[PDB]
Design a protein around this ligand. Sequence first.
Ligand SMILES: [Mn+2]
Ligand SMILES: [Mn+2]
Ligand SMILES: [Mn+2]
Length: 222
Amino acid sequence: GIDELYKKEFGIVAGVDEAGRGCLAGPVVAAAVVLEKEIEGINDSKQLSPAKRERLLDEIMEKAAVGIGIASPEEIDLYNIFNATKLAMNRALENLSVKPSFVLVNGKGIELSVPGTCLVKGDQKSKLIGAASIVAKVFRDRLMSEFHRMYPQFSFHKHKGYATKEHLNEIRKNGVLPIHRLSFEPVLELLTDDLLREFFEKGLISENRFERILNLLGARKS
DNA sequence: GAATCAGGTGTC
Ligand SMILES: [Mn+2]
Ligand SMILES: [Mn+2]
Ligand SMILES: [Mn+2]
């Protein structure tokens, strides 16, 4: 119903949500979702079972229009997690085929390239956002799994890059990766100016990424 | 799914 109020008022209304905010690795995934056909079971992903999201997505990506945006781990470091988040969100709206006259954005304090509004707990106040919530999360998880493929020594399919005990084990044992968020404190902690220069000399990170994390590295213990 | 332990950073 919340959706319908805004639908009647503003016209085409997209729901937006993102996943991967609190992660130590990988990009942040945002999803924009416009939908008219009803989908029973709609609810914020984190209440659902991983396998149910799966069946709800197949359904969602059949009755709805969906845009997907991502922001690079490099962009998180250079821009911060928040602007990287808005950036990802705006890339989703961009990828959406339907151009909404209005957006419902989960959270607070986010203003996108499309006039809209910000709902706290929006992912459980709105069906569109709850749906955008399931798209982001599943798509993200998928990105992380194939990262276990690219870095076999890493349980990215289990911990999704988050600060779990075993993720921190895999980092101390195996080292820090370019896809880790180098500005994120637990990583900054383990990283050395020596590995940082290597990343750069290998052409793995950017000159701008290097300068930041380097300046961040020397700023430690302050 | 809910409880409760862990672990991240942006806004203001
Ligand atoms: Mn929520
Ligand atoms: Mn959510
Ligand atoms: Mn900070």
